[PDB]
Structure formats: C-alpha cells, structure tokens
Design a protein around this ligand. Structure first.
Ligand SMILES: O=C1NCc2nc(Sc3ccc(F)cc3F)c(C3=CCNCC3)cc2N1c1c(Cl)cccc1Cl
Length: 350
C-alpha cells in the first residue's frame, strides 16, 4: 500500500517523490547527490530531502550508501539529525536504483549565526552544550563523527542544534589542501595520520568550534597542513615523550621531533575576557594527546554547563552493530541490504 509518486525535474535530475511532499525547491547539489527543501503535508513540517546520486555504481559506493542509511536510521536524539522518512519509487529490488532521505529543515548552519549575530557567553553555553549532548549519544554507540564543523551543525530560530552529516564519502586530498575550512577543525592525529584515531577527535573539533564562537575568529586557520600544525603546537605546546611513542607513523613522528620545542601557552592570556570556566574547559578539550582529552560525558558535567546540565536528560544510544564495516560483499549484496533497510523503515511516532 505504497504512496503515489509524481515526477519533476528539479536540478539536473528528475525527482520522483510521494504526493505528501510539495513545493520542492533546490538547496544544493554535489557528488553526494542533490538536496531539496519541501513541505510535508502529512505532518505540517518543513523538510529537507536528499536524493543520492549513483548509489550503487561501485562496491565502495553501494557500501557508503548502506552505511549512511544505517547511521541515519539509528539516530534517535534531539541534537542529532533524525530520519523522518526514506523512500524509493522502485516497486521491487530489481527496479531499485534510487534512494531519497527526509529530515527536518532547520534553516541555518552554525556559520550563519557566528557571522550575522553577537553570541553572549550564555549563548555559547547553550550551543556547545547541545553539541556535547548529541556527542555523548553518538559516542555511546561507538560511532565517530570525524568531521564536526560549523557547516555540519544546524540551528533554528530558537537556537536549537542538531548534528549532521554521517557516512558521507571521505574528503579528497585536494579538498583538504590549502586555506580551507574543511581542515581547520580536524584533530592533528587524523590531519597527519599519526595513529589509529578514535572518538576523541570529535572533542578536539568541539574545542575549535567553541573557541570560534567565543572570539568570533577561526582558532587554527592554517594555510596548509604544516602551517596549521604549527599554529596548533604554538598554543598547546610540542608533543611530550609519552605522545611521541604513541605515534605509529615513523615518518610523522620523525618530522615532529625536528620542530623546536615550545611550551603550552596560557589560555587565560589567549582568550582575553572569556568566562574563566570557558577557558578551563577549552584547556581540557584542546589537549594534544587524545587519550588525555576530556570525553563528552565528562565535559557535560563541567561547571561551565551548570545552568544546562541534567544527568537524567542526556540519554545514550542503543547498541549499534557495525560488523558490516569489515565485511566483503559484492555490489548486488550491499544493494540488497540497503533495499531491506528502506522497506523495513518505520516512521517516527508523531
Ligand atoms: O536545515 C537543514 N536540515 C537538514 C539538512 N540536511 C542536509 S543533507 C540530508 C541528510 C539526511 C537527510 F535525511 C536529508 C538531507 F537533506 C543538508 C545538506 C548537506 C550538504 N549540502 C547540501 C545539503 C542541509 C540541511 N539543512 C540545512 C542547513 Cl544545516 C543549513 C542551510 C540550509 C539547510 Cl536545508
């Protein structure tokens, strides 16, 4: 008893969606696919619909698409993009070739805010609080974001925030080259493949983000990998003996020991005028050694979030089986799996 679809040439492609979705307008296209805004007559919500482009053109692609669908279907938290609906005009696995994803329309990312507004210390408390709240949830499911940036953070007029972008194709080296904001928020360990990274990489991103909202400027706006690494070490000091031994890459560790030793600066003199509690939290987040970096759970209990902290209202996620990450299958099988997920989907209770 499927809906009734209608075709329409939006942007370079022909979107075929259920009748419930009207007034679709372009929002942006890319290798990932195409995104449209629309009004969901069945719920009265304004939504954003994404049509995946060539989801099963390769094994690497069919797998990515399965990953993204699995991630989005799993997310059930207020500060994390939830999946309101997912459909395909296809009537059987044989026809199956298109995938459409539907989620809330927030309206603006975090870049807009920090540009056309003035953030009080109270605002920074609320915004970062929600990022950390959603992060405690994500990490509790052994899920790593890996790419937290202001553009991956959606906010509405009420200043409520939702973390976005999961299971997206990794950034090409060209995308990480030069004076680009796509690298400014990454932790040094992944930016230079120092070791096997983990969730602590997101905490570093939050640090970079929180600093920007407080000062209104990018924390480590490097013109390239090396220049960015220098800006970092300049603030947090050069690696100690303990951190060097953890750097698996003999090449990277080699380049590091060639840099003149520098002491960790004084955050109080760097972030002048900032809430002393903000400064302290920033020192707990921006720690070069990832093992000693504060966790999201620990940060939420930090005095800087007293006004908002609520130990009974910061839920964790259910188990997320991602054993498929090390499974070797053919396009067809990844595709069939994706299809099963689409049909087994269950709309949010509301
Ligand atoms: O407000 C929202 N809500 C959801 C959303 N999802 C996406 S992608 C996407 C993912 C899952 C899904 F079900 C549905 C989805 F659409 C993008 C995109 C990410 C990459 N670039 C293109 C769009 C932008 C938004 N914006 C948005 C933001 Cl944060 C700022 C300005 C305008 C909008 Cl519509």
């Amino acid at each position: 008893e499927r809906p009734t679809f209608y075709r329409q040439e939006l942007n370079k492609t022909i979107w075929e969606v259920p009748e419930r979705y009207q007034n679709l307008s372009p929002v942006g296209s890319g290798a990932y696919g195409s995104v449209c805004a629309a009004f969901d007559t069945k719920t009265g919500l304004r939504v954003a619909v994404k049509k995946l482009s060539r989801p099963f053109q390769s094994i690497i692609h069919a797998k990515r698409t399965y990953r993204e669908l699995r991630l989005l279907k799993h997310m059930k938290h207020e500060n994390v993009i939830g999946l309101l609906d997912v459909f395909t005009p296809a009537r059987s696995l044989e026809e199956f070739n298109d995938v459409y994803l539907v989620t809330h329309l927030m309206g603006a990312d975090l870049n807009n805010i920090v540009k056309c507004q003035k953030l009080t210390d109270d605002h920074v408390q609320f915004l970062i609080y929600q990022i950390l709240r959603g992060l405690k949830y994500i990490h509790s499911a052994d899920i790593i974001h890996r790419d937290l940036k202001p553009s991956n953070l959606a906010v509405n007029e009420d200043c409520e925030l939702k973390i976005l972008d999961f299971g997206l194709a990794r950034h090409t080296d060209d995308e990480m080259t030069g004076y680009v904001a796509t690298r400014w928020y990454r932790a040094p360990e992944i930016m230079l493949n120092w070791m096997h990274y983990n969730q602590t990489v997101d905490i570093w991103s939050v640090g970079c983000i929180m600093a920007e909202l407080l000062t209104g400027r990018t924390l480590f706006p490097g013109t390239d990998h090396i220049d960015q690494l220098k800006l970092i070490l300049r603030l947090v000091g050069t690696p100690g003996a303990e951190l060097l031994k953890k750097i698996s890459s003999e090449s990277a560790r080699n380049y590091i020991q060639s840099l003149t030793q520098m002491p960790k600066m004084n955050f109080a003199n760097v972030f002048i005028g900032a809430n002393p509690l903000a400064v302290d939290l920033l020192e707990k987040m921006l720690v070069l050694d990832s093992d000693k970096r504060i966790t999201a759970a620990q940060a939420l209990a930090h005095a800087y979030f007293a006004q908002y902290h609520d130990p009974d209202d910061e839920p964790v996620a259910d188990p997320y089986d991602q054993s498929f990450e090390s499974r070797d299958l053919l396009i067809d099988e990844w595709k069939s799996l994706t299809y099963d997920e689409v049909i087994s989907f269950v709309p949010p209770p509301l």
